[PDB]
Design a binder for this molecule. Sequence first.
Ligand SMILES: Cc1nnc2c(N[C@H](C)C(N)=O)cc(-c3ccccc3Oc3ccccc3)nn12
Length: 124
Amino acid sequence: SMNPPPPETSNPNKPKRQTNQLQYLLRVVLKTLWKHQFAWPFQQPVDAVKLNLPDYYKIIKTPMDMGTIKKRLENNYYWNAQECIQDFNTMFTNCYIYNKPGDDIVLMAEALEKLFLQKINELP
Ligand SMILES: Cc1nnc2c(N[C@H](C)C(N)=O)cc(-c3ccccc3Oc3ccccc3)nn12
């Protein structure tokens, strides 16, 4: 079995722009979620080979994770904050789609998402 290539994190043809909102997303949002006790499964792409989840990438067609988001913020991949917010939302939704309500992993994602939304309420 094999994992897919990770989501794109570098593309010199994509126009980039630093904004104070993107800086907040890195300095506050990403860095706070990263240290949460439930962040670890989300700090890198799902390794479906290591976890023996052969259907994962048959079902999840837009993978996303905070390791990828961290790379996208630290080597600025984005034009606007909404693109980054969308990446977080894709990460959460993938987990809810692949797993069952009330599963441990879903409860972990829900805790991260609650925190994420609280921080987004203070986006500058
Ligand atoms: C993201 C994302 N979305 N779904 C899953 C997922 N699903 C499987 C079917 C499941 N038993 O819940 C597992 C993991 C995952 C990643 C790295 C290391 C261990 C992992 O297993 C965990 C399982 C429960 C809680 C914590 C970790 N990450 N993950």
